[PDB]
Copies of this chain bind each other. A is one copy, B any other.
Amino acid sequence: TNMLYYTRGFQQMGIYAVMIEKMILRDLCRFMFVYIVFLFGFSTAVVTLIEDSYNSLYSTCLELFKFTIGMGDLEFTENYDFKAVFIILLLAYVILTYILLLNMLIALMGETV
């Protein structure tokens, strides 16, 4: 990653790496606060609902990060008792994080660039 330092001998790659700096600081840090709040938020709500495996806070936070990277199973458990609750809660998650907040990030970057 620190070869991106040496993109500053080159005007187009150096400016490219300055934009990477600014994106990390304004666009992505604003993003990752709200994303980790949502993630940890619905994560607790999911593992609370799960009963005995994905009855852990890591594996639920880890499965809920698979959605943003496009690897989210909406049926990674049957070990619950309420299915409307489980899917209303994940649909709430993959709308406010995937549909909204990632595509919003792209919009913010364009404003930034």
Identical chains in the assembly: 3
Q: Which of B3, B31, B71 contacts A37 (CB 8 A)?
A: B3
The reply to whether A107 and B100 contact each other, CB–CB distance below 8 Å, is: no
Q: Which of B17, B37, B87, B106 contacts A107 (CB 8 A)?
A: B106
Looking at chain A's contact residues, the main secondary structure is helix
Q: Which residues from B are CB-within-8-Å of A103?
A: 102, 105-106, 109
Range of interface residues on A (Cβ < 8 Å): 35 or more
Quick check: is A54 within 8 A (CB to CB) of the other chain? no
Find residues 2-32 in chain A having any chain B CB closer than 8 Å to their own CB. 3-4, 7, 12-13, 16-17, 19-20, 23-24, 26, 28, 30-32
Interface on A for B, CB 8 Å cutoff? 1, 3-4, 7, 12-13, 16-17, 19-20, 23-24, 26, 28, 30-34, 37-38, 41, 62, 65-74, 87, 91, 94-96, 98-113
